[PDB]
Design a protein around this ligand. Structure first.
Ligand SMILES: [Cl-]
Lengths: 45, 16, 45, 45, 16, 16
């Protein structure tokens, strides 16, 4: 049982890293949208 | 910004 | 103790799934904002 | 070994909370962008 | 896009 | 909205 618990914990760790990678990608796109809105505002208004 | 290229019409939102 | 560890691991798994669901919802809204900026740019500029 | 497993589980829990905090911050910025697009649309169109 | 309906004024950002 | 201040030019996107 200890080995099964350990293997599951490593799998949870792995998934946590993929979640963190997903979050980084979301932040990069969110920053592009912030830039896009700033650009529209400056160019038009 | 926006992928460079002089602006590039937004470059599709920097390629999404 | 093993049962307490196992129950906690299942709870962490459950929360990881809710986090993943939260992320999916954020991505859907982020994609709407990308569409909205694209629309403003096309309609106006 | 049980103590090592327990300490790792508490560390995973801690990280899950930081991830949740990150998500809350992303949501606050995403809501600002939603407001910004709504403002541009109303002011211009 | 934007919830359809011909655009619908944005449909409140596709209902948020 | 946007940080108040009458709008404040967007206040840098409410300080990012
Ligand atoms: Cl997690």
């Amino acid at each position: 049982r200890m080995k099964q618990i350990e293997d599951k914990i490593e799998e949870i760790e792995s998934k946590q890293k993929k979640i963190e990678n997903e979050i980084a990608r979301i932040k990069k796109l969110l920053q592009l949208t912030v830039w896009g809105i700033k650009q529209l505002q400056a160019r038009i208004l | 910004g926006x992928x460079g290229x002089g602006x590039x019409x937004x470059x599709x939102x920097x390629x999404x």
